[PDB]
């Protein structure tokens, strides 16, 4: 009824410990969601074309051209680690767990409140808020996954991360097909390159409507909506990282000399002349058996063209890479292609007392050593005469195509049947949790945005919309906008996310890396004297595991 509650607030985390070292992590998240009525009740096909920014030669990477359908519906997205776990929960998980499974997900909407706003004619403005007990909130769950998948973590538009702060749903939109061409250039290119928006291919048009595709529930103040429990079918996610590159695979060489006194410069020596050694190499025209030249089982990682931009029907885009840079852990300034950079607002980690439109940003440097250090690569002639001469070697300091700033490693790909690589680590709190698999016939081996990828399906998207609240002057044949009472809704959202994790075992004599509080990061986890909060980022794959 009007005065009866339809649900309970729960933002607790439960750790039920099953048999055989497994734990059943249940994460409950409850939010107060504020929803305003849409700016228009209509679907808009809008086209963006920043020809002013791209008309500057050399700015082709700043292209924003696209077409999208703008919908009156809003999306309630909880696909971010911060919606479920606070820093203590994350510390427990990443310090005590070895692997993580995604089990089930359910959500519900309860305690719906719809209000109206009326402004007086008094010369000094004043306005009052009234309940509309008969107003309804439209709710649609796309359980069949008919609508385009639009995960909000990409735009930092999921639900907030604080149980005690109200949150909002992101207005919903999806990409409408367009054709675009942009010929790249540089500062000093003669003429204006081709920079044209071509229009839309009729064979690719897809105008989706929530009304025509999803059942819609009308909720009054006494109604509730529950989705039911969806069960995932994803692969396990590892909370451990690999440090072994190809140089650390297999039996090391026997040291026929070992140091007799401890010290930095007291090295051990193999003691066998290099071309007189025993072992296996994949180089049939040399007798040198060295650490660089000895055969290894396979490859760990792969070189890829970095900051390579590829063009298709819709315009340029960056070629994605599955691993981060080498040497970035030692020097953060060297973090580059492959190290994901997140920008976010005050709902999602930025100090809440800060003023200004500038977001908080961090580049996520992962602990796994699967990257490449391109400054250390080189090609050389098949003859393999050592020491190598200038004409028989290609170094990263060597111009490709006549350019002093482009070398061979920029256009270099070594992905092959021998490549081994890991899935992307989880990123707390701004990282996406699960992603839908592409509907291509042949599927990618991994996703760069989520550690969990859904094979068959995973949960439909939850859309909300304040139902139209018309005045007495409505005329559907009028060309002007709809006359509506200023109406908005506040409703409570509760979700349950279930994980299954495996407790870790100490395999080594030494202790491992763990997340801890210290004097430096002490005040990143508590409120300020004026109530400000922040959620800094945390690394996930702390513990090391042996690759081979």
């Amino acid at each position: 009824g009007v005065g009866i509650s339809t649900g309970t607030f729960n933002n607790q985390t439960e750790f039920k410990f099953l048999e055989n070292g497994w734990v059943y992590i249940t994460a409950n998240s409850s939010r107060l969601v504020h929803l305003n009525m849409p700016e228009s009740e209509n679907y808009r096909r809008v086209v963006v074309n920043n020809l002013d920014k791209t008309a500057v030669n050399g700015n082709m990477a700043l292209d924003d051209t696209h077409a999208e359908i703008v919908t009156p519906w809003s999306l309630v997205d909880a696909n971010a680690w911060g919606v479920w776990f606070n820093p203590g929960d994350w510390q427990l998980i990443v310090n005590t767990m070895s692997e993580l499974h995604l089990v089930s997900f359910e959500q519900e909407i309860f305690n719906v409140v719809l209000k109206t706003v009326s402004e007086s004619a008094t010369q000094p403005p004043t306005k009052v808020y009234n309940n509309d007990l008969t107003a309804s909130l439209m709710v649609a769950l796309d359980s069949n996954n008919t609508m385009p998948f639009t995960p909000a973590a990409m735009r930092s538009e999921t639900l907030g991360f604080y149980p005690w702060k109200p949150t909002i749903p992101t207005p919903w939109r999806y990409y409408f097909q367009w054709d675009r061409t942009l010929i790249p250039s540089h500062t000093g290119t003669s003429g204006t390159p081709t920079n044209i928006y071509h229009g839309t291919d009729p064979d690719d048009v897809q105008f989706y409507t929530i009304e025509n595709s999803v059942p819609v529930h009308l909720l009054r103040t006494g109604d509730e909506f529950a989705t039911g429990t969806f069960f995932f079918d994803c692969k396990p996610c590892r909370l451990t990282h690999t440090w072994q590159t190809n140089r650390a695979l297999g039996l090391p060489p026997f040291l026929n000399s070992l140091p007799q006194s401890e010290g930095g410069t007291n090295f051990g020596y193999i003691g066998v002349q290099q071309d007189k050694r025993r072992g296996v190499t994949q180089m049939g025209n040399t007798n040198y058996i060295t650490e660089a030249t000895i055969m290894r089982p396979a490859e760990v990682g792969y070189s890829a063209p970095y900051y390579s931009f590829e063009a298709s029907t819709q315009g340029p885009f960056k070629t994605p890479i599955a691993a981060g840079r080498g040497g970035a852990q030692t020097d953060e300034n060297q973090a580059a292609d492959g190290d994901p950079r997140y920008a976010f607002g005050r709902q999602h980690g930025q100090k809440t007392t800060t003023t200004g439109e500038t977001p908080e940003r961090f580049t996520y440097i992962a602990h796994q050593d699967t990257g490449r250090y391109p400054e250390g690569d080189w090609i050389q002639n098949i003859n393999f005469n050592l020491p190598v001469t200038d004409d028989n070697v290609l170094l990263p300091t060597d111009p490709i195509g006549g350019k002093t700033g482009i070398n061979y490693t920029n256009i270099f790909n070594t992905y092959g049947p021998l490549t081994a690589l890991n899935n992307v680590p989880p990123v707390y709190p701004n990282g996406q949790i699960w992603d839908k698999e592409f509907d291509t016939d042949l599927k990618p081996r991994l996703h760069v945005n989520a550690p969990f990828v859904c094979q068959n399906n995973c949960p439909g998207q939850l859309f909300v919309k304040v139902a139209p609240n018309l005045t007495n002057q409505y005329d559907p044949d009028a060309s002007a906008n709809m006359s509506r009472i200023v109406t908005y809704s506040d409703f409570w959202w509760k979700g349950k996310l279930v994980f299954k994790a495996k407790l870790r075992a100490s395999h080594t004599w030494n202790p491992i890396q763990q997340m801890s509080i210290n004097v430096d990061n002490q005040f990143n986890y508590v409120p300020s004297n004026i109530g400000g909060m922040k959620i800094v980022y945390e690394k996930s794959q702390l513990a090391p595991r042996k690759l081979y």
């Epitope: 204006t192 390159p193 044209i196």
Partner: antibody, heavy 126, light 109 residues
Framework: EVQLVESGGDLVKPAGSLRLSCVAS????????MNWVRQAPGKGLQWVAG???????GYADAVKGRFTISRDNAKNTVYLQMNSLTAEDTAVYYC????????????????????WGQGTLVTVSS | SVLTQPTSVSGSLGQRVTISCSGS????????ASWYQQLPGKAPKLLVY???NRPSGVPDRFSGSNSGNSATLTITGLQAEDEADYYC???????????FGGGTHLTVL
Amino acid sequence: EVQLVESGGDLVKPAGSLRLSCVASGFTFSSYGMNWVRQAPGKGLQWVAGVNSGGFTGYADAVKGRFTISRDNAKNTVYLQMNSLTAEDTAVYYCAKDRYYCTGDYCFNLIAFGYWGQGTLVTVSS
Amino acid sequence: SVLTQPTSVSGSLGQRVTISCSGSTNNIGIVGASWYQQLPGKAPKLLVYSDGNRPSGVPDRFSGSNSGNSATLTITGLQAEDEADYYCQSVDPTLGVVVFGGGTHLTVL
């Protein structure tokens, strides 16, 4: 090779109306826009109007309130309708094709005529 | 919006010729000019695109460039084939109006 042929020239009174037509061939007609550019005797070229695949049109400020242009992709034909003609409209009108593929509402951001017809004469006088 | 061209330009056989077209940030500063050739009484012919490319069969003699709000057409190795009239064409994206220049007559000496 691309080829265009125009028609419809005539002499009309200083306040009459007239209609012109071009026929095209040799390319994907629906993918490229078609334009009407005129040249007064002894003067330079002047743009009149253009129409794209979906029927969207653009008119110069000199003819925006008077003229009308249309297509028929099933017939590879483009028409121009002129109303309330004045003496200044006297010129030879040339029918041309765009180099760039544009179809819908958001054209006229990049235009470059790559093939041309033969032209037809329009004379406005008593 | 209208483009500006010099009335005439003169060059001698074997020399270099330059024709200049001036516009604004609204027309040429975003979409560069495209150059056309018109023999007396004949239909125009495109010579250089806005990006410096030429239609198939156009000699490399013809070239173009864009700087700020002005564009130029350069004819190298002027031959007797080049005695004609030339026009600069640009489109205004703000208004959606195609703009031609006033035209320039080329004299070969």
